[PDB]
Ligand binder design. Structure first.
Ligand SMILES: NS(=O)(=O)c1cc2c(cc1Cl)N[C@H]([C@H]1C[C@H]3C=C[C@@H]1C3)NS2(=O)=O
Ligand SMILES: N[C@@H](CCC(=O)O)C(=O)O
Lengths: 89, 380, 169, 99, 49, 85
């Protein structure tokens, strides 16, 4: 009967959170209570810098392979054929 | 500011030595009641709360029980346990328990605060990206094909001007015309889409949540922090107020005051003021309402009052029980309340020592118009 | 621009932060991190890409960013392309009237900066992730200056090559 | 065109209770207190002097205050400050730009 | 001159459009008279006791 | 069940394209190729000052549409009623 008394007043509700949580030291329950705004770091935005240097790598490469081509779609009779294979596929 | 000695206290002696709120109050009592007074400081230093089982409340009340003093014009809480041993008059101030903490130090002004939503590394690496793209857009656009390479308007200095026009979003009259030149201009357009919109989005974020706040500004917030410990004055009625606790959040406060590592109590309230300043945001101190606003008006303004009063108690002029002197003094409290003197004496010591000058009522509004001091850097 | 980088590769005051020196301020770098303001002072330790509480397992993003950082392949390629650019400048005097080594030089000086600019980023991005109030010293500003000086050489290498084929024109 | 002066616990009781169409501005011009009154020299004066201090220290007067001013009247604005909602523009919001 | 005025534009416009939704939907009270000193200096209203 | 914490997740290299899902980035590029081929096909319908007045080839119409999408407009504008739609 004494357990059925204590469960109805809420003592076991009061005892369980006191020993588990309050004696415990982890403050993850109130770490999310506050939120902040920070500056963008370079670790956050570096893929755009990676595409840019990758874009400059492609830009210098195409200007070089076209230049060696000049130093040293096409032919209408076959572009009808590429259209037919294109229309079929 | 109740009773504190003059600056020339070592020169003067007698009743002219002491000044303060109660000294001005003691002058006004005898002016209306018709006696002559003599000020005697207690040798204790504690207000005189419950005795250590000895029962002679050690402090002011022990001087009132012993018959050594006639009246107590002093900051002394009218509570139940003091009423049974001595007499009180009607209260002359109203005050409550209040949590006093450190300033958050989240102010953070700036002159170049427009460069803030991106880091210093990015504003560096933008300039390195700006120069690096501008020379690649040049080196692409000027090879061997009047001359057919002269048809392009892309010199290096036009390439410096094109990359700035794409980054500043304004656009340029020139635009690349070759397939190799549209790759370098195309990727830089993708660069300035993300980087500028990262600026315009975060500058909206730094112009909505720029504020100073304290995370523990409520009663229940201070109850749940083992990181921010809390204690109060030893041998006071505030300490006695938590000994007889009733409410569940007040019982929760009494748990941490017992299991305190180390002992959170101080001998004098100013020692608790000095303990919060040495703790630098990791300890709180619960003292009175009228005491807390006096700390705000003193140097170096590094405290703040959070939350409303926990209760509503008061201070009263006290006589020992059964004293004939004290019944017109009860009328003398009601006189100085009626002719505004208790207001005016409170208007005396709380106005003239306002060296802090903040008067921080605060602005809870979030829609604040931009001052010129926010964006004065771009005008420079 | 070659001498600025080969100093900055060799010297080791790239980063000033709170860190350990034997396993509080540090003379950190790409390879050898050192220490100042301590009982130890200058007892330089070769830095390691530690897994102990880094807790990365099959993280292809995190592993490749740190393996490039532990190799420092982009600042080293910023040296190798920059010396071969200088070899083309030395091969402009000798083997002259070829006129295409001047084009060939300006490619290597510009691509040395492209090797430099992403070498800046893989140094900074691998760094953060605390080290509060960190400082970048002046070794990092040598490679920052080694970026800009190497570009203006690749600028002026092209503008000479402009005058070479306007002479052929 | 009419600004009325009364006591503080009246004005809070008016503003909390519906239709809640007045506003309490400023502070207290003169601070005073309601007191339970007994005849002079009564034997029923001194336990009355002790009984108010019983209820104030234990927290009954605080518990009586939080009970009665919440129970009768609740204008909805006093607890609606936490709720934030978004809405569309109206033409009344941007009308001078058209002007 | 054009390059710096563009950098002036990019800051002032982005500081303008940062919270433009809230300044068109302010929903603030006017608070005409308060604290009994503005009551001392504005006597168009009538008092009552 | 007990596990060890994730301890956090870093935002990735390509986290800039997280505000739109990967269905949208497919459909934007499909809208990009769709507009560019149409804008070429609209302006070239065989009316030298004939057929050569418009600058909009297929490679220019790729460059106008990517120009209009990246918020930096180009020099060429359609200059025809069906083209300007
Ligand atoms: N608000 S306060 O502390 O400045 C303050 C508080 C109080 C004052 C005067 C002041 Cl200035 N006097 C009143 C007095 C008027 C009559 C009612 C209570 C006593 C007799 N008591 S109080 O209500 O405790
Ligand atoms: N005036 C108070 C000071 C001590 C306290 O605040 O508890 C008193 O004597 O009770």
């Amino acid at each position: 009967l004494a357990v059925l008394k204590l469960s109805e007043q809420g003592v076991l509700d009061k005892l369980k959170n006191k020993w588990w949580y309050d004696k415990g030291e982890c403050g993850a329950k109130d770490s999310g209570s506050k939120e902040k705004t920070s500056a963008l770091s370079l670790s956050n935005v570096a893929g755009v810098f990676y595409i840019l240097v990758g874009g400059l790598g492609l830009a210098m490469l195409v200007a070089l392979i076209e230049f060696c081509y000049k130093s040293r779609l096409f032919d209408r009779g076959v572009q009808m054929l590429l259209t037919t294979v294109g229309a079929f596929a | 500011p109740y009773v504190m000695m003059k600056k020339n206290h070592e020169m003067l002696e007698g009743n002219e030595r002491y000044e303060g709120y109660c000294v001005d109050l003691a002058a006004e009592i005898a002016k209306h009641c018709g006696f002559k007074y003599k000020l005697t400081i207690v040798g204790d230093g504690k207000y005189g709360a419950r005795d250590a089982d000895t029962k002679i409340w050690n402090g002011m009340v022990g001087e009132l029980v012993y018959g050594k003093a006639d009246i107590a014009i002093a900051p002394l809480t009218i509570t139940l346990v003091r009423e049974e041993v001595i007499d009180f008059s009607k209260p002359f101030m109203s005050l409550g328990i209040s949590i006093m903490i450190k300033k958050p130090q989240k102010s953070k002004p700036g002159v170049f605060s427009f460069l803030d939503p991106l880091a210093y590394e990015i504003w560096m690496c933008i300039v390195f990206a700006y120069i690096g793209v501008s020379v690649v857009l040049f080196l692409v656009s000027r090879f061997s094909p009047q001359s057919s390479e002269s048809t392009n308007e892309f010199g290096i200095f036009n390439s410096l001007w094109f990359s700035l026009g794409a980054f500043m979003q304004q656009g340029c009259d020139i635009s690349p015309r070759s397939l190799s030149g549209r790759i370098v201009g195309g990727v830089w357009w993708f660069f300035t889409l993300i980087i500028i919109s990262s600026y315009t989005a975060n500058l909206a974020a730094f112009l909505t949540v720029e504020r100073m706040v304290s995370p523990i500004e409520s009663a229940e917030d201070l109850s749940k922090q083992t990181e921010i410990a809390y204690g109060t004055l030893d041998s006071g009625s505030t300490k006695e107020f938590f000994r007889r606790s009733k409410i569940a959040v007040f019982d929760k406060m009494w748990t941490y005051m017992r299991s305190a590592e180390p002992s959170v109590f101080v001998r004098t309230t100013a020692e608790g003021v000095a303990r919060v300043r040495k703790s630098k945001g990791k300890y709180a101190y619960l003292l009175e309402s009228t005491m807390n606003e006096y700390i705000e008006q003193r140097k170096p303004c590094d405290t703040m009052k959070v939350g409303g009063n926990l209760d509503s108690k008061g201070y009263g002029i006290a006589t020992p029980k059964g004293s004939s002197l004290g019944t017109p003094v009860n009328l003398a409290v009601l006189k100085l309340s009626e002719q505004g003197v208790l207001d005016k004496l409170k208007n005396k010591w709380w106005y003239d020592k306002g060296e802090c000058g903040a008067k921080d009522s605060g602005s809870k509004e979030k829609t604040s118009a931009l001052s010129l001091s926010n964006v004065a850097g771009v005008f420079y | 621009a070659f001498s600025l980088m080969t100093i900055a590769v060799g010297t080791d005051y790239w980063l000033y932060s709170r860190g350990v020196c034997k396993t509080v301020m540090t003379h950190s770098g790409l390879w050898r991190t050192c220490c100042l303001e301590g009982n130890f002072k200058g007892l330089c330790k070769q830095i390691d890409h530690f897994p102990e509480d880094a807790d990365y397992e099959a993280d292809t993003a995190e592993y490749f960013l740190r393996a490039v950082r532990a190799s420092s392949i982009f600042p080293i390629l910023s040296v190798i392309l920059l010396f071969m650019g200088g070899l083309c400048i030395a091969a402009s005097e000798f083997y002259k009237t070829r006129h295409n080594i001047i084009l060939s030089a300006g490619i290597f000086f510009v691509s040395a900066g492209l090797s430099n600019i992403i070498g800046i980023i893989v140094y900074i991005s691998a760094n953060a992730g605390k080290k509060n109030s960190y400082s970048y010293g002046w070794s990092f500003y040598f490679g920052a200056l080694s970026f800009i000086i190497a570009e203006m050489v690749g600028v002026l290498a092209v503008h000479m090559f402009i005058d070479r084929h306007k002479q052929l024109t």
